[PDB]
Amino acid sequence: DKISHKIDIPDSAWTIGIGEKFKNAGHPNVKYPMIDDSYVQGAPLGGFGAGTIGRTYNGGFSRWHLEIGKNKYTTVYANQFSVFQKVEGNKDGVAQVLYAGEPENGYLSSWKWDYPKESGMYYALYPNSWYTYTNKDLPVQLAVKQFSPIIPYNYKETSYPVAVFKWTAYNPTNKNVDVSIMFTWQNMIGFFGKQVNVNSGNFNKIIKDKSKDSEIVAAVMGNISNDNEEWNGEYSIGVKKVPGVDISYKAKFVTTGDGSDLWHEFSKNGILDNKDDETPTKQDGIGSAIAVNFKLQPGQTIEVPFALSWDLPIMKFGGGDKWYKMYTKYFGKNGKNSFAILKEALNNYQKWEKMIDDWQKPILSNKSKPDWYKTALFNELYYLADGGTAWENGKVGEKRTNNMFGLLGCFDYNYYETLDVRFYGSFPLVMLWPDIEKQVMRQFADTINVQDSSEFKVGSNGAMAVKKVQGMIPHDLGSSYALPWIKINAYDWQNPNIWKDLNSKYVLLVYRDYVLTGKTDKEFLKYTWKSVKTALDKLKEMDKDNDGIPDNEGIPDQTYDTWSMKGTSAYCGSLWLAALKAAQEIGKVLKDNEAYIKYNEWYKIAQQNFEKELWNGEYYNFDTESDHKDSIMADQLAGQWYADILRLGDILPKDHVQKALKKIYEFNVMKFENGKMGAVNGMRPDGIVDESDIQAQEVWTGVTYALASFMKYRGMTEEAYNTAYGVYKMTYDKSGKGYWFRTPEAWTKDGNYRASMYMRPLSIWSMEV
Ligand SMILES: OC[C@H]1O[C@@H](O[C@H]2[C@H](O)[C@@H](O)[C@H](O)O[C@@H]2CO)[C@H](O)[C@@H](O)[C@@H]1O
Numbered sequence: 001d002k003i004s005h006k007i008d009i010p011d012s013a014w015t016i017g018i019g020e021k022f023k024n025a026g027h028p029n030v031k032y033p034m035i036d037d038s039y040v041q042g043a044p045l046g047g048f049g050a051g052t053i054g055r056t057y058n059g060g061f062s063r064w065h066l067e068i069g070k071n072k073y074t075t076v077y078a079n080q081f082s083v084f085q086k087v088e089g090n091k092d093g094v095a096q097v098l099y100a101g102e103p104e105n106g107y108l109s110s111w112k113w114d115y116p117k118e119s120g121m122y123y124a125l126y127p128n129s130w131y132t133y134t135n136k137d138l139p140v141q142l143a144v145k146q147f148s149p150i151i152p153y154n155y156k157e158t159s160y161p162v163a164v165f166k167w168t169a170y171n172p173t174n175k176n177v178d179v180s181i182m183f184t185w186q187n188m189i190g191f192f193g194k195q196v197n198v199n200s201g202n203f204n205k206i207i208k209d210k211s212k213d214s215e216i217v218a219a220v221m222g223n224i225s226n227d228n229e230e231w232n233g234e235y236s237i238g239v240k241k242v243p244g245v246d247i248s249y250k251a252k253f254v255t256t257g258d259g260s261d262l263w264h265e266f267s268k269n270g271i272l273d274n275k276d277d278e279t280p281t282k283q284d285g286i287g288s289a290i291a292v293n294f295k296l297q298p299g300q301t302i303e304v305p306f307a308l309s310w311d312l313p314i315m316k317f318g319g320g321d322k323w324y325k326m327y328t329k330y331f332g333k334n335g336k337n338s339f340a341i342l343k344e345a346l347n348n349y350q351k352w353e354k355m356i357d358d359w360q361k362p363i364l365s366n367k368s369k370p371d372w373y374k375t376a377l378f379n380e381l382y383y384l385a386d387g388g389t390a391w392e393n394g395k396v397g398e399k400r401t402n403n404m405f406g407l408l409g410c411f412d413y414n415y416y417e418t419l420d421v422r423f424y425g426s427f428p429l430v431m432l433w434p435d436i437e438k439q440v441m442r443q444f445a446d447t448i449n450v451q452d453s454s455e456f457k458v459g460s461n462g463a464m465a466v467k468k469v470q471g472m473i474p475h476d477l478g479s480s481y482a483l484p485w486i487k488i489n490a491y492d493w494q495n496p497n498i499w500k501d502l503n504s505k506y507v508l509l510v511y512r513d514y515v516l517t518g519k520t521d522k523e524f525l526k527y528t529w530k531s532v533k534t535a536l537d538k539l540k541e542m543d544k545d546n547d548g549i550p551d552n553e554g555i556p557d558q559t560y561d562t563w564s565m566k567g568t569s570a571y572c573g574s575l576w577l578a579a580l581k582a583a584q585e586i587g588k589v590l591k592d593n594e595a596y597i598k599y600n601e602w603y604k605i606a607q608q609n610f611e612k613e614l615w616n617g618e619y620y621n622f623d624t625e626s627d628h629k630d631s632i633m634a635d636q637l638a639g640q641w642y643a644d645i646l647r648l649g650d651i652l653p654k655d656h657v658q659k660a661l662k663k664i665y666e667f668n669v670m671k672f673e674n675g676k677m678g679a680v681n682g683m684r685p686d687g688i689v690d691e692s693d694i695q696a697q698e699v700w701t702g703v704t705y706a707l708a709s710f711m712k713y714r715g716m717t718e719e720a721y722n723t724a725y726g727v728y729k730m731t732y733d734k735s736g737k738g739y740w741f742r743t744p745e746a747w748t749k750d751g752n753y754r755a756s757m758y759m760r761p762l763s764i765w766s767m768e769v
Pocket residue numbers: 032413459492493561562
C-alpha cells in the first residue's frame with residue numbers, strides 16, 4: 001500500500017478489506033419477518049430527503065432508499081467503477097471491475113468480475129468514505145474518496161441528490177503505465193414506481209460543457225416522457241477534465257445483455273467509442289459509460305473527479321400523497337435537472353471537502369478522545385440520511401414558509417419521528433441542524449389538540465381504541481405506507497393516547513431545543529407553550545391515587561412497549577419530574593406566573609413522593625406495583641439525564657443519582673457479558689437478568705449511549721466510555737456482530753438483534769453536549 005500516503009484518511013475511519021468475509025454476523029431474534037440485509041453495507045450517498053444510495057464495502061450500489069421510506073437491497077450490477085492498465089512495452093493491458101463479486105445471471109458476463117481479496121481496503125468516516133486498490137496485477141495504485149455534502153448548519157447542499165468520487169492514481173513503479181477509470185451506470189428510470197413497461201422510453205444523452213478551464217462530460221439518463229410522476233426524472237454521471245487526462249464515453253450499452261458492446265472497447269485500450277445515441281429503449285435495460293484515460297510516469301500522481309446525481313423530484317407515499325423533495329428548491333421541480341446538480345458538484349467539490357473537514361476537525365483534533373469513539377460518533381450519523389428521510393418542498397398540485405421533515409424510527413416499524421424514540425435519537429438534529437429540529441417540534445405542537453374519534457384495533461390485546469385523543473401527543477407523524485404529516489399515530493401495537501412518557505418527553509424536547517440553541521429562541525417557546533401546558537395538564541389526570549404522579553397501568557404504556565409498568569415508575573416518574581421543572585422555567589421565561597406556580601407545586605409534591613416510593617438505599621426501584629418492582633433498570637433516571645442537559649439542576653439528590661449510576665454500571669453493564677455489550681435493560685438485585693419480558697433482556701443501543709452521556713456529565717468518565725464501548729464493539733469491531741451502517745434498536749446476550757437501521761442510537765451525540 002503506497003496509495004494511502006497520497007490521500008488523507010483519518011485514523012478513526014472504520015475499515016474493512018474489500019471482499020472480506022465476516023464470520024460472526026448477527027441475525028434477527030424475533031419470530032416474525034424482519035429485515036436482514038447482511039453485513040455487506042457501506043456509508044450512504046445522498047442528501048437529506050434526496051433518497052439515498054448505499055454503496056457497500058465490496059463496491060456495489062446495493063442498498064436503495066430512493067423510494068422514500070423504503071429499503072430495497074439489490075445490487076444493480078451495471079453500476080460500477082472499472083480500471084484498465086497497460087504497462088509501456090507490454091502487448092496487452094488488463095481490465096477489472098472494482099467489485100468483489102459477480103452477477104447472479106448471464107448479464108454483463110463479458111466484464112471482468114470478482115475483484116480479488118487482500119487487494120484493497122474500504123474506509124468510512126461519514127459523510128466520507130474511501131476505497132484503496134493495491135493489487136499485484138495493477139501497477140498503478142488507485143484510491144477514491146466518495147461523499148455527499150452533508151454539512152451542519154447548512155440546509156442547501158445537505159439536501160442535494162449528489163455524490164462526488166474524487167480519484168487519486170499513483171505510479172510507484174519504474175515504467176510508464178497507461179490507466180483508464182470508467183464509471184458505468186444503468187438508466188434506472190422505472191427501477192421503482194412504474195407498474196408496467198419499466199424500461200420503455202428510457203434514453204441516454206451526452207452533455208459536453210466546454211467553458212474555459214472547466215470542461216465536463218456527462219451522461220443524462222432519462223425518459224422521453226415529460227410526465228410529472230414519482231418514477232420519472234433523470235440520473236447523471238460524469239467527469240471534469242483535468243490536465244493530462246482525456247475523456248471518452250459511450251452513451252448507450254445494453255444492461256440486459258452480455259455487456260461486450262462496452263467491454264470490448266474498454267478492455268482493449270481503456271478508450272470508449274464516443275458514440276452518441278439517443279434512441280429510446282423498449283424492453284431492454286440500458287446504461288451509459290464515462291471514462292478517463294491518462295499516462296502516469298514513474299512517481300507521478302494525478303487526481304480526477306467524477307460525480308453522480310439523481311433528479312427524482314417527486315416522492316409518493318402509500319396513502320396517495322405526492323410531495324416535492326427539498327432539493328427542488330435549488331434546482332427546480334420538472335425532473336430534467338440532473339446535469340445542473342452534477343455540474344454544481346464537479347465545480348465545487350473541493351470547497352465541500354473543506355466544509356466537511358471544518359466541521360469534523362474540532363472532534364478529530366481532540367487527542368483526549370479515543371479513535372473508536374470518533375468512529376462511532378461520525379458513522380452513526382449515516383442514519384440522518386439513510387433513515388427514510390422525507391423533506392418536502394410542496395405538495396404536488398399545491399406555497400408555505402416551512403418545509404416539513406421526517407426521519408423514520410426504523411424501516412421494520414415504519415413510523416415518522418417516533419417521539420418516544422426521538423427523545424434519544426434527535427440529538428444530532430438539535431446540535432447540528434437545529435432549524436430542522438425546531439420544525440419537527442412545531443409539527444408535534446400543531447397536533448396536540450387534534451382529535452380523531454375513529455377507532456383502530458390495538459395489536460397487543462385486540463381491543464378497540466380512539467385513534468387520537470385531544471391533548472395527547474402522538475406517537476408518530478404517520479407511515480411512508482400511508483400519509484406522513486397528515487395521518488398521525490400510524491403505530492398500533494399499543495394505544496399511544498394512554499402512554500405516560502410521550503407528553504413529558506415532548507415538553508423535555510421543547511425545552512432542550514431552547515437550551516441547546518443558546519436560550520435565545522423565545523418565539524419557539526411562545527409557539528409551543530400552549531401545547532406544553534396542555535400536555536402536562538392531561539398527563540396529571542392519569543394520576544389515579546393522588547400522589548402527584550401519573551400511574552402506569554400494568555401494561556406497556558411507554559417506549560418499552562412490551563415491558564409493563566405499574567404504579568409510579570422510575571422511568572415515567574423521573575421524566576414527569578423533569579418535564580414539570582422544564583415547564584416551570586418556560587413559565588418564568590414567558591412571564592406566565594400562574595403556570596410557574598402550578599407546575600412548581602406539582603413538582604414539589606411529585607418529587608417528595610417519587611423519592612419516598614422508589615429510593616431503596618442503593619438505586620431507584622423499577623416501579624411500585626409490578627412483580628419485579630425491585631429490578632434495576634438501566635434507564636431508571638432518564639428524567640435526571642435530560643435535566644442535566646437542560647441545566648435544570650438536581651431533581652433527585654446528587655448522592656442517590658451517583659449511587660444509582662454506579663449500581664447500573666456494576667450490574668446492568670458489568671454483570672452482562674463482562675460489560676462488553678452495553679447496558680442490559682433490566683437486572684434483578686441478585687445479578688441475574690430480569691426475565692419478565694424480552695425487552696428487559698435486551699441492550700438498547702440508544703439507551704446505552706444516552707446512559708454513557710449521563711455517566712460522563714456526572715464525572716464517571718471511565719464508566720461512561722466503557723459502557724459506550726460495548727455498543728461500538730458490537731456494531732463496528734471484528735469481534736462484534738456486523739451491524740455497521742445498520743445499528744439496531746437492540747440485541748440480546750447472544751448478539752442477535754431486533755430492528756436494524758434504527759434512530760435511537762443517534763443518541764451517541766448526547767455525549768458531545
Ligand atoms: O408494531 C411495532 C411493535 O412491534 C412489536 O412486535 C410485535 C409485532 O408487531 C406483532 O406483529 C407480533 O405478532 O408480536 C410482536 C410482539 O412479540 C415490538 O415488540 C414492538 O417493540 C414494536 O414497537
